[PDB]
Amino acid sequence: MKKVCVIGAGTMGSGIAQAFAAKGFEVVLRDIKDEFVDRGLDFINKNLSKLVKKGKIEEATKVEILTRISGTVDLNMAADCDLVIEAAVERMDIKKQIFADLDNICKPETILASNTSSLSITEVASATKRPDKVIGMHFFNPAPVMKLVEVIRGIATSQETFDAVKETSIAIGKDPVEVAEAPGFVVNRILIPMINEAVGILAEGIASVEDIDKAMKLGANHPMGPLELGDFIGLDICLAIMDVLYSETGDSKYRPHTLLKKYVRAGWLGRKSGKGFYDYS
Amino acid sequence: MKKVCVIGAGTMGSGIAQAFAAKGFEVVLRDIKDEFVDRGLDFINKNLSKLVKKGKIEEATKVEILTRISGTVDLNMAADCDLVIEAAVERMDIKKQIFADLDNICKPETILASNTSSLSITEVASATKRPDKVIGMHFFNPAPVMKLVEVIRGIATSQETFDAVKETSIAIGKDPVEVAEAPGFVVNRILIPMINEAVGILAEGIASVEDIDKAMKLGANHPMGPLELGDFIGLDICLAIMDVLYSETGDSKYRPHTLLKKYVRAGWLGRKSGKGFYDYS
Amino acid sequence: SGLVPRGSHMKKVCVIGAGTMGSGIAQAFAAKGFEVVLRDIKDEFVDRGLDFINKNLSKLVKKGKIEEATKVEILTRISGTVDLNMAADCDLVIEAAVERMDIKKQIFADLDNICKPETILASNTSSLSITEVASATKRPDKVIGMHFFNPAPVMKLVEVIRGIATSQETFDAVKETSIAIGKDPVEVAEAPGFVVNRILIPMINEAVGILAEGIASVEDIDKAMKLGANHPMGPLELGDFIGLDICLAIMDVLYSETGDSKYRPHTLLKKYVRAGWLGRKSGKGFYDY
Amino acid sequence: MKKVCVIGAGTMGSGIAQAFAAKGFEVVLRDIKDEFVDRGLDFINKNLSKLVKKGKIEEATKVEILTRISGTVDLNMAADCDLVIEAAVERMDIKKQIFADLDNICKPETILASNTSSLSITEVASATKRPDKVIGMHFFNPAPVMKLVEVIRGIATSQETFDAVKETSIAIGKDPVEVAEAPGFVVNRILIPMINEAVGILAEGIASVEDIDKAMKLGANHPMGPLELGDFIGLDICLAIMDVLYSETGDSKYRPHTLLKKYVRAGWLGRKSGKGFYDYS
Amino acid sequence: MKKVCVIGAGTMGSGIAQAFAAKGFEVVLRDIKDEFVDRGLDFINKNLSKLVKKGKIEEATKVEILTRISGTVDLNMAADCDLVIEAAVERMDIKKQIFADLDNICKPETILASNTSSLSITEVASATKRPDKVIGMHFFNPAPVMKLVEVIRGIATSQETFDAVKETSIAIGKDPVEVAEAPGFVVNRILIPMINEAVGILAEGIASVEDIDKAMKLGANHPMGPLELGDFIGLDICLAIMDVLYSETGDSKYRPHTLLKKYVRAGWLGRKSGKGFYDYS
Amino acid sequence: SGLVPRGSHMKKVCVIGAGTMGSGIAQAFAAKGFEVVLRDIKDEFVDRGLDFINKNLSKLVKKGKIEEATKVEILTRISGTVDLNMAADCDLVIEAAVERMDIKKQIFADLDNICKPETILASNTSSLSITEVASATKRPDKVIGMHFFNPAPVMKLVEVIRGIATSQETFDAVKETSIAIGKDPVEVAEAPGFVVNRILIPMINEAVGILAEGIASVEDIDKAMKLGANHPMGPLELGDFIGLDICLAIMDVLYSETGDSKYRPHTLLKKYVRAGWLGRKSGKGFYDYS
């Protein structure tokens, strides 16, 4: 694998383009309108800057990397790629189209991956005629820095495909784990319900938000407490993941707490809005 | 606020006594037979020893510490204390008798406390005629080191009893949190189900134990993966907690996984037994 | 004996257990003309029931509800005893003992042997299976539940609990004599909570959940149900009135019997019961008394 | 507070308007067409007519009251009110647009309230720029007579706003209770599952509809049995509320019975159809 | 009862048509296009050809039967039919639309029946002014051969209507059972969760697909194992039935397995797609 | 030992429990050429077991499936005993005693001390944890489930239940021997209800729920399953045949282990059982037998 197309130039996709080019990959980068593309690369630049300034790298490089990334709106710039990675909108009917297109645009050895965290990789792969070569590559925010990628295997994902994607994840200095498609994969499945439990304790007046976080930081030696972490991830993001667990499994076990619903409804989503379980004023 | 009795010379009780003496409290240490008392004073002797074998402490306040800690089997030796802490075994029929007697044996001002994780403070207080000063003091193994204390308020626990125990927890260098009785308090209530969730991912073949633990470490920035963590706490202890959550709440959400039961049934309880989710040589 | 209403073929009743409910039930029968045998184990206990009935009848002569000479005639129709054999010729026996399947089964086993073939044997239990109890006898077609409501002499509802084996003829007879003592019987196929408790106690339990998440205060919960639903009492004070220990045990039974989490008792309700704040009877519940 | 606007001239809108007018408030009653406004005015006229015929008030008192009520189809007539109460259809996209216009129409002091039984106050509040001033005021049918109102605090509802709405409630001779937003508030939360439990008993052949209602009447000393009560509230309404409980909480505990579904699907909704659990021929 | 109309010339519709015609009933077979009606008539011709080829029926009995069947695109031709059987649309709004015209189109005594498994008969009957005359008639594939018919009563279906459909089920050589409308009736309600349970056993690595099926053929003397039975029915249909059971009852008990979902998402639907739990290559 | 099929390396088998299943299991091994030790607590029970076997074989003789002399030969390979020590040299022990974990652990612990290191110890339990039982021995790798179906001489299936510590070799040996006695074994990792009961008993429980809600009658429920799913018996009939108390006890276990309300036993099944209406064997369950 030498050339990579990353689709969707948002926070995640542009982070993913960085991570790859910062390791010698020829990176294509598509979105839907030149505006979006630019918001994207403009996003990557700001980031390298912070590193050059921190003296974690040398301007000389930033320039170099930024020349490996080639923005675009022509979907067809992917035909050439060895690996495509979609980090578009968490909406199924669209992923299916992007994927059915790419299945046609791209040569046969291309592997089509998705960064989705809550849609079925298996179902997306059914839109193509190469489901053996469809897979999940779940990055973590922020992508250039974070080591983990959950590589999500659809039920039809071949071993060849898994192996190549795993290899590539190592070439770019990441640390992949192997996951069979299931709701929430490994990390969200375990982490988010723990946040949901914390809000359940708070809601019952068992303890306060600060004592809950402290108990977790000190009791289980966690870096951040659950509620805090909730605000940091975003409570809407947390809510939507619980929703997905509940809806996929059909198990009350994963019902999101009623209080969480209320915070989200109020627009109190945490840090990104100045207010969640804590105040950011 | 000076004299402190401790019942139970197991790991927990012994560590609590040590943690108290270490800050200059007169400490009694009670069990039902010298073997245990000695066996516990013995255990203290070592940690304190393992300590003076680094820069940790001077051998002056090794021997100065063991001076403050006087061990007995004479329940009657508690009568003077300002605070008492039960760390005996998790049988309720027994904790009530322990607590009733102490109710007669002590001075009106004496506050009684338990270190239980899984029995109701409130129900225990009901054995006594001073519920207003019955409380929970939940320590974290190893007691001398771990800073957190969950102060568990029975429903009848007075705010004065609470404020005392809070002050005397900070007194001894700990960092208490106020918890109202409910199953699993805060830490266990959040953390154990997280372990339970990880076994469920393992059971369905989603990921391997190595990958599950690695995903949680890199993805959630946890110091230990949950399966490794369960092996460390002990899988029997993990299961007893989930049993209690399920039993107390009556909510299926907290049902212990079927695979976790099988591990415990095999005696594969983790580190202490040489085998759990991981093999320990 | 012609003082017993013609609608009821049965004419003699044994009540076993001389507690509150048992005294009350004997009083209700005696008041309507039945010869009543009232049995317990110690003479102390029987005598405690008889002058509990006395105390009640005394209260009625004082409000001019009945004449003093009528009270006397009623107490005259109730004969205390410890001899379970006195039940032998009774047409109906109502057990109002403590709630232990194993004791209760023994009583019914005993009675089944003691009593003539036509006798019907009834329990006033709230939470134990009539069918199981009937299986400890050789006349399960004559075993039945008769669930009275405290206070028995006043409250008109009787929840006739039919077992899987209780015969129509046995239900028909218990129904007519329930009417004959001025009660209003409903026909219930054994199931957890019958009707009243099944609906009513989860209502209380729902209320404590609202309280527990701080949705409303207890005063506002009880106020809301009284004004909004036109209930004579608010759920929380009603729980305090029934007894919170009693409420928890009923929810325990509903969850146990059905296996459905729907009926799990609230954590907070357990916690009040564990403090011993059982409501009115103990001076403290959701309200201070 | 002196001027009140009610949006919606159905049974509740009109009843609410009347209860305000009867106690000396000026009332603007608005709806989308004259014929609706007229209808609600007609409906109010009759109720008052009864009270005169019944010798509860005088023809004189009745014309006073009618005089304090002004009809209109123009939402702008709310610009000037201290309190707007919304009693429209239980649709969220609609309640949001109403509340958003009001936000722009009304003076900053105007409090915006909803008589909704099942939509989120918090979520409605979020469609405006005055969330501190959005609140739930839940009246019980028939509004002029029923004393109770549930004052529903959204999560950002100010203490000022609650205090005003409470004083105003007391001032129209009502009895207010404070309720933080939660599915079914207090009354529907207890009451409707009670009815739903009764249909479950019926569905399993445990007892007949007459016997069930009679047991609850004599056994619990209720004025109506649950089944005749469901027929009186309306079975469709009972089902919609069970639906909301279950949807909001995610807990199977509040799943509506299967038989209730079937009755509603038949159009056997209770008194309003001539048929529910009872026949009303 | 003598003339029957069948709406839908697909597999079930023409099966049901053939079943009636073979027993001497006049049958009108309607679909929306000549294309579809001919297809269904061809399908029936082939079935009756198979039967003469295997000497089950004379080739002039075949002729008699086809003579008793008229094709049409016009619902108006149901007008004088004594019984109409709808066997197409598994969409509620279209079913209601159809039942509503038939109600206007048909003599008053016409009974109107659905072959649906998943949609409420009661709800469908409500779109008509003759709900006493609306009933479920549930056939089993292949309709000419399978003897069972589940006769599904809406809550308003009358005894008379039930009795007529029972007697005519028997006259076409079938064996009716009386079922009060409820989710999955009898057969699907018991059978499909059997299959869904088998997939849960497979998912947990408890046994292999071959052993699970073997265990049920030998252990319970079933003709097919649950997993091959699922393949044979179609996993998309099994999943939809479980969706309905969960949807209707709101009970988690009937939640479809996560793994069944993954299979249907892959398009591995069983025999009909060449792959399900088994490979049919 | 020349009469033992060569496919089985195990040659000597001991069965513990002379009840219906244990003595059916003994008969199944003996009829295939194994020497069997049949052990119970009192001579009286052993004799009941031997007589049960005798009776089954006499039917076989009566139907001409076997000759009278074969019946007596087969009985001669079964040795009744109360001496649990007769197991010491056996290659395979199968426990089919009462369904009580405390008793079962004791038996297994005795056998572990008595028997040679090679002996494999199996339980026919349908409801207790194999793994938990194995923990009461010092040879858990050699502990296994061997779940037979009533009647054991005729039903071909055996569910072979591997505890978490059950070795491949132990499993392989049980599989071989299973095949050797004409059975068809399946490999089952320990889980509540294994395969068959897990699927089959909730079917029955679903049917009582249908009946309880007035959806269909018992006759119609069973008719529909026979005709509709091509089942040879309807589920309520089947419940009656198995024993309603057995069916309830299996749901209890399914619910107890999983903690999932999905497997809660229906309220009306509880009530039948409490009545003593257990099905065929009590003359009454969902059908009346007469």
Q: What is the CATH number of the domain that holds D220?
A: 1.10.1040.10
d(CA B242, CA B257): 9
Burial class (CB in 10 A: 0-12, 13-18, 19+), D73: middle
- Do residue D55 and residue D151 come from a single domain? yes
User: For residues D280 and E169, is the Cβ–Cβ distance under 8 A?
Assistant: no
Whether residue F290 lies inside any domain: the answer is no
C195 and D179: CB-CB below 8 Å?
A: no
Which chains does E contact via 3+ CB–CB distances below 8 A? A, B, D, F
F228 and E191: CB-CB below 8 Å?
A: yes
Q: Is E30 helix (H, G, I), strand (E, B) or coil?
A: strand
Which residue from A61, A77, A104 is spatially nearest to A9, judged by alpha carbons? Answer: A77
d(CA A28, CA A2): 11
Which residues in chain A have their C atom more than 2.5 Å from the N of the next written residue, marking a break after them?
Answer: none
* C141's tokens: 């077609």
**B266 neighbourhood in chain F, CB within 8 Å:** 131, 134-135, 140, 163-165
User: What is the bridge-based pairing of β-strands B111-114 and B83-86?
Assistant: parallel
Find the farthest-apart pair of alpha carbons in chain F and give their distance in angstroms, rounded: 60
Which residue from B264, D46, F104, E193 is spatially nearest to B277, judged by alpha carbons? Answer: B264
User: For residues D5 and D28, is the Cβ–Cβ distance under 8 A?
Assistant: yes
Cβ-based neighbour number of residue C51 at 10 Å: 13
d(CA A202, CA A213): 11
DSSP E256: P
Phi then psi dihedrals of residue F163, to 5 deg: -70, 170
**D156 neighbourhood in chain A, CB within 8 Å:** 266
Burial class (CB in 10 A: 0-12, 13-18, 19+), F74: buried
Which chains does D contact via 3+ CB–CB distances below 8 A? A, C, E, F
User: For residues C193 and C199, is the Cβ–Cβ distance under 8 A?
Assistant: yes
- Do residue E216 and residue E270 come from a single domain? yes
Whether residue F156 lies inside any domain: the answer is yes
- Do residue B163 and residue B254 come from a single domain? no
E251 and D256: CB-CB below 8 Å?
A: no
- Rg of chain C on CA atoms, in Å: 20
Cβ-based neighbour number of residue F48 at 10 Å: 15
Could you tell me the end-to-end alpha-carbon distance of chain A, in angstroms, rounded to an integer? 47
Bridge partners of D151, per DSSP, are D137, D178
- Do residue A200 and residue A98 come from a single domain? no
User: What is the bridge-based pairing of β-strands A134-138 and A148-153?
Assistant: antiparallel
DSSP D106: S
Catalogue the E-assigned strands of chain B: 3-7, 26-30, 69-72, 83-86, 111-114, 134-139, 148-153, 175-180
A248 interface with E at CB cutoff 8 Å:
yes
- Do residue B77 and residue B166 come from a single domain? yes
Which residue from D3, D12, D6, D2 is spatially nearest to D29, judged by alpha carbons? Answer: D6
User: For residues F176 and F158, is the Cβ–Cβ distance under 8 A?
Assistant: no
With residues binned 3-state (H G I as helix, E B as strand, rest as coil), the percentages for chain E, rounded to 5, are: 50, 15, 35
F255 interface with C at CB cutoff 8 Å:
yes
A146 — alpha (psi -120 to 50), left (phi > 0) or beta? beta
Indicate the residue of A204, A252, A258 with minimum beta-carbon distance to C212. Answer: A204
D248 and A266: CB-CB below 8 Å?
A: no
Catalogue the E-assigned strands of chain A: 3-7, 26-30, 69-72, 83-86, 111-114, 134-138, 148-153, 175-180
- E188 assigned to active site: yes
d(CA C83, CA C86): 6
User: What is the bridge-based pairing of β-strands D134-139 and D148-153?
Assistant: antiparallel
d(CA C260, CA C198): 13
Which residue from A141, A138, A98, A116 is spatially nearest to A11, judged by alpha carbons? Answer: A141
* E201's tokens: 């056993």
d(CA F69, CA F87): 27
d(CA E172, CA E6): 15
d(CA A116, CA A130): 18
Torsion sign across C-alpha atoms B111, B116, B118, B119: negative
Cβ-based neighbour number of residue C17 at 10 Å: 24
Indicate the residue of E186, E197, E208 with minimum beta-carbon distance to F198. Answer: E197
CA atoms within 13 A on the CB side of F240: 19
Which residue from D116, D111, D101, D156 is spatially nearest to D8, judged by alpha carbons? Answer: D116
**F142 neighbourhood in chain B, CB within 8 Å:** none
d(CA F49, CA F42): 11
* C19's tokens: 């507690």
- Do residue F88 and residue F138 come from a single domain? yes
- Do residue F43 and residue F161 come from a single domain? yes
**Cβ–Cβ pairs < 8 A, chains D and E:** 33
Amino acid at C264: R
Please give the residue range of the domain that contains residue E161: 1-187
* C244's tokens: 């919170």
* E131's tokens: 């709900």
Angle at E165 between CA E159 and CA E168, to 5 degrees: 135
Residue C192 Cα to chain centre, angstroms: 15
Residue that is written with structure tokens 């938000």 in the block: A209
d(CA D214, CA D227): 10
Bridge partners of E151, per DSSP, are E137, E178
Q: Is E180 helix (H, G, I), strand (E, B) or coil?
A: strand
User: For residues D21 and D29, is the Cβ–Cβ distance under 8 A?
Assistant: no
- Do residue E121 and residue E38 come from a single domain? yes
User: For residues F159 and F195, is the Cβ–Cβ distance under 8 A?
Assistant: yes
d(CA A115, CA A100): 16
Residue that is written with structure tokens 């920035």 in the block: B221
Which residue from A147, A129, A131 is spatially nearest to A139, judged by alpha carbons? Answer: A147
Q: Is F186 helix (H, G, I), strand (E, B) or coil?
A: strand
d(CA D233, CA D141): 9
Torsion sign across C-alpha atoms C229, C232, C237, C238: negative
Find the farthest-apart pair of alpha carbons in chain E and give their distance in angstroms, rounded: 59
d(CA F205, CA F263): 9
d(CA A151, CA F156): 44
Q: Is C112 helix (H, G, I), strand (E, B) or coil?
A: helix
Which residue from D227, D236, D185 is spatially nearest to D208, judged by alpha carbons? Answer: D227
Domain boundary among F174, F196, F218: F196
Amino acid at B225: G
Residue in chain D closest to F212 (alpha carbons) equals D204
* B268's tokens: 């594969």
- Do residue F216 and residue F179 come from a single domain? no
A279 interface with C at CB cutoff 8 Å:
no
- Do residue B244 and residue B113 come from a single domain? no
Whether residue B178 lies inside any domain: the answer is yes
Burial class (CB in 10 A: 0-12, 13-18, 19+), B33: exposed
Burial F191-229 (b: 16+ CB within 10 A, else e): bbbbbbbbbbbbbbbbbbbbbbbebbebebbbbbbbbbb
Whether residue E281 lies inside any domain: the answer is no
F276 and C164: CB-CB below 8 Å?
A: no
DSSP D246: H
- Rg of chain A on CA atoms, in Å: 20
Cβ-based neighbour number of residue E240 at 10 Å: 18
- Split into its structural domains, chain E has a count of 2
Q: What is the CATH number of the domain that holds D146?
A: 3.40.50.720
Amino acid at A171: A
d(CA C282, CA A7): 69
Domain boundary among E187, E205, E221: E187
* C30's tokens: 């005696």
- Do residue E168 and residue E82 come from a single domain? yes
Q: Is F126 helix (H, G, I), strand (E, B) or coil?
A: coil
Whether residue F212 lies inside any domain: the answer is yes
- Do residue D120 and residue D43 come from a single domain? yes
d(CA E117, CA F53): 49
A266 and D181: CB-CB below 8 Å?
A: no
Q: Is D86 helix (H, G, I), strand (E, B) or coil?
A: strand
d(CA A79, CA A75): 8
The DSSP element (H or E) to which C114 belongs, if any, is: helix C101-114
Which residue from E260, E254, E265 is spatially nearest to E227, judged by alpha carbons? Answer: E260
d(CA E132, CA E112): 10
Whether residue F25 lies inside any domain: the answer is yes
F151 upstream amide cis, omega within 30 of 0: yes
d(CA B188, CA B246): 13
Find the farthest-apart pair of alpha carbons in chain D and give their distance in angstroms, rounded: 58
d(CA C85, CA C88): 5
Most A-contacting residue of E196, E260, E261, E277 (CB-CB within 10 A), to test interface: E261
Phi then psi dihedrals of residue A186, to 5 deg: -110, -50
**D204 neighbourhood in chain F, CB within 8 Å:** 212-213, 267
User: For residues F124 and F25, is the Cβ–Cβ distance under 8 A?
Assistant: yes
F130 — alpha (psi -120 to 50), left (phi > 0) or beta? alpha
Sheet holding B175-180, edge to edge: B69-72, B26-30, B3-7, B83-86, B111-114, B134-139, B148-153, B175-180
- Cβ neighbours of residue D278 under 8 Å, at least 6 residues apart? D209, D227, D228, D231
Q: Is A74 helix (H, G, I), strand (E, B) or coil?
A: coil
C151 upstream amide cis, omega within 30 of 0: yes
Domain boundary among F160, F177, F196: F196
D262 and E131: CB-CB below 8 Å?
A: no
Indicate the residue of B123, B154, B183 with minimum beta-carbon distance to C267. Answer: B183
Which residue from F227, F181, F200 is spatially nearest to E219, judged by alpha carbons? Answer: F200
* E136's tokens: 């479920």
d(CA B267, CA B137): 30
Whether residue D281 lies inside any domain: the answer is no
Residues of F carrying an active site annotation: 126, 147, 159, 197
What kind of experiment solved this structure?
X-ray
D73 CA to chain C: closest CA distance, Å?
32
Which residue from A193, A180, A171 is spatially nearest to A252, judged by alpha carbons? Answer: A193
User: For residues A148 and A18, is the Cβ–Cβ distance under 8 A?
Assistant: no
